Curated annotation (Swiss-Prot), chains A, B, C:
<feature type="repeat" description="Tau/MAP 2">
    <location>
        <begin position="2"/>
        <end position="32"/>
    </location>
</feature>
<feature type="site" description="Not glycated">
    <location>
        <position position="67"/>
    </location>
</feature>
<feature type="modified residue" description="N6-acetyllysine; alternate">
    <location>
        <position position="25"/>
    </location>
</feature>
<feature type="site" description="Not glycated">
    <location>
        <position position="102"/>
    </location>
</feature>
<protein>
    <recommendedName>
        <fullName>Microtubule-associated protein tau</fullName>
    </recommendedName>
</protein>
<feature type="cross-link" description="Glycyl lysine isopeptide (Lys-Gly) (interchain with G-Cter in ubiquitin); alternate">
    <location>
        <position position="96"/>
    </location>
</feature>
<feature type="site" description="Not glycated">
    <location>
        <position position="17"/>
    </location>
</feature>
<feature type="cross-link" description="Glycyl lysine isopeptide (Lys-Gly) (interchain with G-Cter in ubiquitin); alternate">
    <location>
        <position position="25"/>
    </location>
</feature>
<feature type="site" description="Not glycated">
    <location>
        <position position="21"/>
    </location>
</feature>
<feature type="modified residue" description="N6-acetyllysine; alternate">
    <location>
        <position position="96"/>
    </location>
</feature>
<feature type="modified residue" description="N6-acetyllysine">
    <location>
        <position position="17"/>
    </location>
</feature>
<feature type="region of interest" description="Microtubule-binding domain">
    <location>
        <begin position="1"/>
        <end position="95"/>
    </location>
</feature>
<feature type="site" description="Not glycated">
    <location>
        <position position="25"/>
    </location>
</feature>
<feature type="glycosylation site" description="N-linked (Glc) (glycation) lysine; in PHF-tau; in vitro">
    <location>
        <position position="96"/>
    </location>
</feature>
<feature type="site" description="Not glycated">
    <location>
        <position position="44"/>
    </location>
</feature>
<feature type="cross-link" description="Glycyl lysine isopeptide (Lys-Gly) (interchain with G-Cter in ubiquitin)">
    <location>
        <position position="102"/>
    </location>
</feature>
<feature type="site" description="Not glycated">
    <location>
        <position position="97"/>
    </location>
</feature>
Length: 107, 107, 107
């Protein structure tokens, strides 16, 4: 009766880089709406019920409401732009990622 | 009775780079709506019920509502643009990704 | 009866870099609304009920409400821009990530 087990994950939710490295840029001249909706939502619902069990699982969702009624721009909207986002994203390293995962079993 | 098991994942939800490396750019002259809807949604619903069990699983979804009523631009909308997004994304590294996954079993 | 187990995760929710490395930039000339909605939401709901058990799980969701009624820009909206975001994101290190995960079992 020699029992030997190596096991990584049995019941797991792994979420990496969720809503990540994000640039949201707005240059309105006039009358502009920008909307960004990033729900990162995670649920383990384990449920045991019965016998007239009245379960009402109701996660209210998000709401966005916009009402513009009176908007007038009588004369002038002018946008003179030179330069957005001068980005040198320079990864210059000759990196070494050594990832040892070694599995020795002598029975 | 020599039992030996190596096993990585049995019940797993892995989510990598979800909604990732994202650029959202708006240059409205006049009267513009930009909408971005990134729900990253994850559920393990384990349910055991019965016997008049009345289950009401209702995750409200997201809502977006836009109402513009009065909008006038009587004279001038002008957009003179030189340069957006001067991006040198320079990965210059001769990287080494060493990934050892070795499986030794001597029975 | 020799029982030996190595096991990493059984019941786990891991969330790394969630809503991460985020730039939100607004340059309105006139009359602009910017909306960003990042809910990072995590739930382990373990439920055992019954027998006229009336469960009302109701997480109110977020609400966004915008009402503009009187908006007039009689004469002039002018936006002269030179430079946004001069970003040298310079990772210059030849980094070494040594990740030893070694699995020795002598039975």
């Amino acid at each position: 009766k020699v029992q030997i087990i190596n096991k990584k994950l049995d019941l797991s939710n792994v979420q990496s880089k969720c809503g990540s490295k994000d640039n949201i840029k707005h240059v309105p001249g006039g009358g502009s709406v920008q909307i960004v909706y990033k729900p990162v939502d995670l649920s383990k619902v384990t449920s045991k019920c019965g016998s007239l069990g009245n379960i009402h699982h109701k996660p209210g969702g998000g709401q966005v409401e916009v009402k513009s009624e009176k908007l007038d721009f009588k004369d002038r909207v002018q946008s003179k732009i030179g330069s957005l986002d001068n980005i040198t994203h320079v990864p210059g390293g000759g990196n070494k990622k050594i990832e040892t995962h070694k599995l020795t079993f002598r029975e």
